[PDB]
Design a protein around this ligand. Structure first.
Ligand SMILES: CCNC(=O)CN(C(=O)c1ccc(O)cc1O)c1ccc(OC)cc1
Length: 208
């Protein structure tokens, strides 16, 4: 049922850096996840321009933000292109090894952690606020999979038998105990407005 994988050394080192570096501007995680959702949405949209059947798995292109205070989770769901199992395993479709190298060189020439998305690894910013991250994805060419990691060097992949998603990627942030501010409606709204206000797809903030 469950396969366990080692992170490549460079990715593990990125995640340690994210987890251990003192850095108060944690809110940028959400901008970086919304940006990835936006890029995935652009991708399925571009494919659909020449093959409309690519949208048979769902026509609507959007991003939902779902806080759950009982589970202590913030969920970001998109209806983008999704990821195959292989892309999930290969660093959630990122150029993580080369991007980590470039990010860490940038960090020695004055950059700060908020600039992580310039290096193609903004996904890992989830670890600013989450103790555990679960990613459920469905790409038209593959089955639905669940990836999971509490960092510490490893991640799991399994076929997901949860709710079918049709197509796209869902990122479930199991928040650290001291980061529950990111479940408050007014805080989420503030961050969306500050950093994600011109995103080209509707962003719906669910209420509880
Ligand atoms: C690049 C083409 N492939 C996808 O578009 C799949 N894509 C996702 O499915 C995805 C991944 C992470 C995420 O938080 C949200 C998402 O929709 C993805 C988006 C960005 C990315 O690096 C910037 C890597 C993968």
């Amino acid at each position: 049922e469950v396969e366990t994988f080692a992170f490549q050394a460079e990715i593990a080192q990125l995640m340690s850096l994210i987890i251990n570096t003192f850095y108060s501007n944690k809110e940028i995680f959400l901008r970086e996840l919304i940006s990835n959702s936006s890029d995935a949405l652009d991708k399925i949209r571009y494919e659909s321009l020449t093959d409309p059947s690519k949208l048979d798995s769902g026509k609507e292109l959007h991003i939902n933000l779902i806080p759950n205070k009982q589970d202590r989770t913030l969920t970001i769901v998109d209806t983008g292109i999704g990821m195959t199992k292989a892309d999930l395993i290969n660093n959630l479709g990122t150029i993580a090894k080369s991007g980590t190298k470039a990010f860490m060189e940038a960090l020695q020439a004055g950059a700060d952690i908020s600039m992580i998305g310039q290096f193609g690894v903004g996904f890992y910013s989830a670890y600013l606020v989450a103790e555990k991250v679960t990613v459920i994805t469905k790409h038209n060419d593959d089955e639905q999979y669940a990836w999971e990691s509490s960092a510490g060097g490893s991640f799991t992949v399994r076929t997901d038998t949860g709710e079918p998603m049709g197509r796209g990627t869902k990122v479930i942030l199991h928040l650290k105990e001291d980061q529950t501010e990111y479940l408050e409606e007014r805080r989420i709204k503030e961050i969306v407005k500050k950093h994600s206000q011109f995103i080209g797809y509707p962003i719906t903030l669910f209420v509880e």
